[PDB]
């Protein structure tokens, strides 16, 4: 996975005195830059899935609309992290954004399962960022993470699990009637 | 097909100095008259399909309403072409309108496939009209065609393809439940 | 006249058990199909006259608008007859629509006189349909004809007669001022 | 005609590096300057006709108002061309504006015929500008011409033709009653 | 200057019995025609300055808007003079409109100074027209001039003088900051 | 430049029968995929500039807001191209998005100049796409490009040129007062 390769890169590759800087360690600055890159990658993956469901031989409108909304949300998350980096007096360092691993998604159920996997990966990354913050005695960063990311990740994971369960019980992926009716009643 | 017979008729059979005529070749006048005839034929075919779905042993209301709307649109297209012919100083020449080739359509899926075929034929005819216009150095006619016909044809073809795909995946034409639910949720 | 040729065709050429059919004779079914063809022919003639008055060397706007409205009305009549055919359990059979006999109409007065002639022909056809219905003891069809066609035909004929009289007394067709004044004050 | 003398002047007499210039040939710049001069000439001619119909021994108010409106429109066209010249990075070069060829117009019909002639001349000039633009592979200029000038020229020519036809059929120029009544109904 | 050449041309070159003419001398008619030509020339000069300030390497929006408004006002003045010529029973005689003397204006201050010069020239011309009117005992013409032109000229000259003074005291033309801020605060 | 490397890559690296495909050549499909990649790159560059002007030792709010708006517009352009690719029956192929070449922008004037350069590069790419479309006789694609991209590029280039000119005349980049006042009055 590209996600793993990005996440396990050393901190020394994510760095380029400010009058506002106070109690802000270099390791935290590098970790914030890495997290920015991960958020942009997630946005790109969601965009790819959305326009997959727009093809003339797939044709499920509400799936595409749902995934496009997810993409816009991921981009907002990245911009918020950049704002924090500027607030505490660090410097932003950017990198290339990788193409998504999958090119064809093959059904609604398969795409939902891939999305669940991606969300759990993002959650694990945020938990490691939090433990790094507690190791350096930085309560402002800890409070920022707790108040803006953790409960949202938990709710998103629960929603995706519910969707997967309902699609499995209805008889997908063999039954196209199931995916048609799920597109109409749950996502519409 | 009657469409092919009409479209491959020579230009000399579609002709009957105006104070407004300027840079308007005889071949273009004849081709416009032929295109008028084709649009009226398409309107007649759509009317036939619409009232097929109104029979007591078929009974799908939203299919009939959809096809009636298509018929009215084709007639509007023909009237716009007649207005252009009068604007540039040519003379309108009319011919008989042929009866449609099919008398029974047998299901919603089959009618959708026939409609897709007819739309692609109309698009091919318009492309030949455009290349004729460019061969004679007539930019006004080229701009008229580009701005009023091409993107509409592309969108109509895409919509019909989506409809055919959804009807196939649900299990039509053997499953009447599929066509009932498609009539309710997509066309209703 | 094409109208006469269409109207005097035998009933055997206008035919292709329904769960709803009751007291509905085959001769009536064939006669309804023939009447549908006649209504479509009348619509086509009115369209031709309308766009004749749009030419740059004629240029009478209100004449053209009047005739276009008549064309739309004739098409509505045809669709109502098709609906009745489906209501009583018959089957619709379509034929070619003939081109109009006249290509140039030469003045407003001449077009009004041709329209009066066409309306009287349609009225005669409807009267024969009514007597056919009474010969077979079908009161529903008789009531349909009486309530939807006869008084409308009478009012249309009276209006056209009034128009012809006024155009003659003003000095048409030699006086263009007359036709100009009729276009402004009566049809505008 | 002064129009012909202006239009057939060589491009070398219509020219005087910008940070915004891109894909903009010198020949096109000169042709735009020439077209500006032509538009201003047309405005001046319309002004002359308008105040001719204001004289005490002619006295047709609505003719004068109509021609004054045409004059204002021509001036707006010229200002739009000057704006385009500044947008693409060329330089404006101005010349003298010639007096109109006619000093007395003698009737409403004669003035309408002269106006039709002038509009057809302007249309021919715009068509030559378009072919020049296509010879140099400049799509922005082509789109500008198509979207702002061609259909307007066509509609104006059609309207003037209709006016001339109606004035001829009523008995002008010998009948003053005809011109009096035309002023009140059509132009008013 | 072209203005001087136009203004010093003899009256015999500005002439081509009306039922309304009374107490209206030929010299006054010719002088009115000459004044019409001068007003149109002033309109053309203002148009040139306006589109000079629209260039991409000058870029001062409010200067351009101000000068365009002046151009429209000059054209209104000319139309009012033509109306008077028709009211008193004279005949309008038109001539060529000369191109402006300056092609590049080089700054806001220089353009303001040129405009002040032009307005004083127009005022001198109007004063000579008034003395001509008093020499022939024509009180209506005198009252027309006094009530529609003199106070407007005085106010315009005062405004332009104020603008020039403010631009000089701020440090123009060497300081671009001065012209930027004057564009924002005084003309905006 | 990364832009040049992306734009000069061969068409064979940008490709992976549809029921809707008609008159759509493989070369055009590959060129559309390449253009999508270029639009996403431009969005990323604008995002980088925007958050550069948010730093505590730069602190110009309206510059940052302006560049963020540009970034959102570029992303909308890319999504529109993806929609077209699906409409005509091709298949989307994605690639990595490159990091921007510049990491520090050093002033408002320098950033404006870099933006002007980038916009001219995008315009050149679109012109080559148009000539490719005309070489294959595809009028729908030509009309799409003309109606959605060319005039917008021209207006954007003109605006950026005006901004650069005004910043130079005020005395930037040495005068911080100039950039402060430009941030307040022009972008605010």
Curated annotation (Swiss-Prot), chains A, B, C, D, E, F:
Annotated site location: Essential for association with cargo receptor NCOA4: 34
Impact noted for substituting residue 34 to A: Abrogates interaction with NCOA4. Fails to localize to punctate lysosomal structures
Pfam families, sorted: Ferritin
UniProt KW Acetylation keyword: yes
GO MF term set: ferric iron binding; ferrous iron binding; ferroxidase activity; identical protein binding; iron ion binding; iron ion sequestering activity
Recorded catalytic activity of this chain's protein: 4 Fe(2+) + O2 + 4 H(+) = 4 Fe(3+) + 2 H2O
Residue ranges of every copy of the Ferritin-like diiron domain listed in the record: 22-171
Entry's localization field: Cytoplasm; Lysosome; Cytoplasmic vesicle, Autophagosome
Keywords: Acetylation, Cytoplasm, Cytoplasmic vesicle, Iron, Iron storage, Lysosome, Metal-binding, Neurodegeneration, Oxidoreductase, Phosphoprotein
Coiled coil region boundaries: none
GO terms for biological process, alphabetical: immune response; intracellular iron ion homeostasis; iron ion transport; negative regulation of cell population proliferation; negative regulation of ferroptosis; negative regulation of fibroblast proliferation
Keyword Lyase: no
Binding, Fe cation 1: 39, 74, 77
Main location, first listed in the record: cytoplasm
Cited InterPro entries: Ferritin, Ferritin-like, Ferritin-like_diiron, Ferritin-like_SF, Ferritin_CS, Ferritin_DPS_dom
Recorded GO CC terms: autolysosome; autophagosome; cytoplasm; cytosol; extracellular exosome; extracellular region; ferritin complex; ficolin-1-rich granule lumen
Tissue: Expressed in the liver.
Function according to Swiss-Prot or TrEMBL: Stores iron in a soluble, non-toxic, readily available form. Important for iron homeostasis. Has ferroxidase activity. Iron is taken up in the ferrous form and deposited as ferric hydroxides after oxidation. Also plays a role in delivery of iron to cells. Mediates iron uptake in capsule cells of the developing kidney. Delivery to lysosomes is mediated by the cargo receptor NCOA4 for autophagic degradation and release of iron.
Pathology noted in the entry: Hemochromatosis 5: A disorder of iron metabolism characterized by iron overload. Excess iron is deposited in a variety of organs leading to their failure, and resulting in serious illnesses including cirrhosis, hepatomas, diabetes, cardiomyopathy, arthritis, and hypogonadotropic hypogonadism. Severe effects of the disease usually do not appear until after decades of progressive iron loading. Neurodegeneration with brain iron accumulation 9: An autosomal dominant neurodegenerative disorder associated with iron accumulation, primarily in the basal ganglia. It is characterized by global developmental delay apparent from infancy, and progressive decline of motor and cognitive skills. Clinical features include delayed walking or inability to walk, spasticity with hyperreflexia, ataxia, dystonia, and poor or absent language.
Family as reported in the entry's similarity comment: Belongs to the ferritin family.
The protein's assembly and partners: Oligomer of 24 subunits. There are two types of subunits: L (light) chain and H (heavy) chain. The major chain can be light or heavy, depending on the species and tissue type. In the human liver, the heavy chain is predominant. The functional molecule forms a roughly spherical shell with a diameter of 12 nm and contains a central cavity into which the insoluble mineral iron core is deposited. Interacts with NCOA4; NCOA4 promotes targeting of the iron-binding ferritin complex to autolysosomes following starvation or iron depletion.
Protein name: Ferritin heavy chain
């Amino acid at each position: 996975d590209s996600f793993q390769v990005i996440k396990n890169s050393p901190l020394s590759e994510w760095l380029i005195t400010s009058q506002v800087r106070q109690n802000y360690h270099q390791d935290s600055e590098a970790a914030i830059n890495r997290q920015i890159n991960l958020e942009l990658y997630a946005s790109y993956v969601y965009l790819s899935m959305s326009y997959y469901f727009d093809r003339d031989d797939v044709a499920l409108k509400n799936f595409a609309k749902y995934f496009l909304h997810q993409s816009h949300e991921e981009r907002e998350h990245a911009e918020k992290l950049m704002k924090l980096q500027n607030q505490r007096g660090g410097r932003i360092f950017l990198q290339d954004i990788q193409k998504p691993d999958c090119d064809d998604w093959e059904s609604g159920l398969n795409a939902m399962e891939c999305a669940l996997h991606l969300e759990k990966n993002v959650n694990q990354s945020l938990l490691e960022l939090h433990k790094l913050a507690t190791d350096k005695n930085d309560p402002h960063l800890c409070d920022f993470i707790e108040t803006h990311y953790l409960n949202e990740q938990v709710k998103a994971i629960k929603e995706l699990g519910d969707h997967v369960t309902n699609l499995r019980k209805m008889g997908a992926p063999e039954s196209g009637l199931a995916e048609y009716l799920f597109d109409k009643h749950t996502l519409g």
